[PDB]
Ligand binder design. Structure first.
Ligand SMILES: CCC[C@H]1N(C(=O)c2cnccc2C(F)(F)F)CCC[C@@]1(Oc1ccc(C(F)(F)F)cc1)C(=O)N1CCN(c2ccccc2OCCO)CC1
Length: 86
């Protein structure tokens, strides 16, 4: 599947070195991961919990925090911020 991130998600992804406009779901996940890692959007205490209440990430996703294990919930949140392309 080829996806075109919407402007705000595009800006967030491009800010961590993503060069293109069209991505695969694995590329969005990778670049979203680089974003979490650089900005340090997690606690040493709980590695699996992303804390994003005060970040553009939580705004686009619509949640204060989420578990890295909640794959289905993460896709739902990402899907809202993209358009599927040819
Ligand atoms: C080796 C660690 C890499 C993971 N990682 C950490 O777990 C981590 C390490 N140290 C400290 C803090 C963290 C912290 F905080 F949990 F992130 C470091 C960053 C990359 C990494 O995590 C995320 C996390 C959130 C998102 C986002 F999309 F925003 F939800 C995207 C990627 C990842 O590539 N996968 C693979 C893709 N996974 C995934 C998510 C949703 C749907 C499907 C998925 O795929 C399953 C196939 O493997 C998530 C984990």
């Amino acid at each position: 599947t080829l996806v075109r991130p919407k402007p705000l998600l595009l800006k967030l992804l491009k800010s961590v070195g993503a060069q293109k406009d069209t991505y695969t779901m694995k590329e969005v996940l990778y670049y979203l991961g680089q974003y979490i890692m650089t900005k340090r959007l997690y606690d040493e205490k709980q590695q699996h919990i992303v804390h994003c209440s005060n970040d553009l990430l939580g705004d686009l996703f619509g949640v204060p925090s989420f578990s890295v294990k909640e794959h289905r919930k993460i896709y739902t949140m990402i899907y809202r911020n993209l358009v599927v392309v040819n």
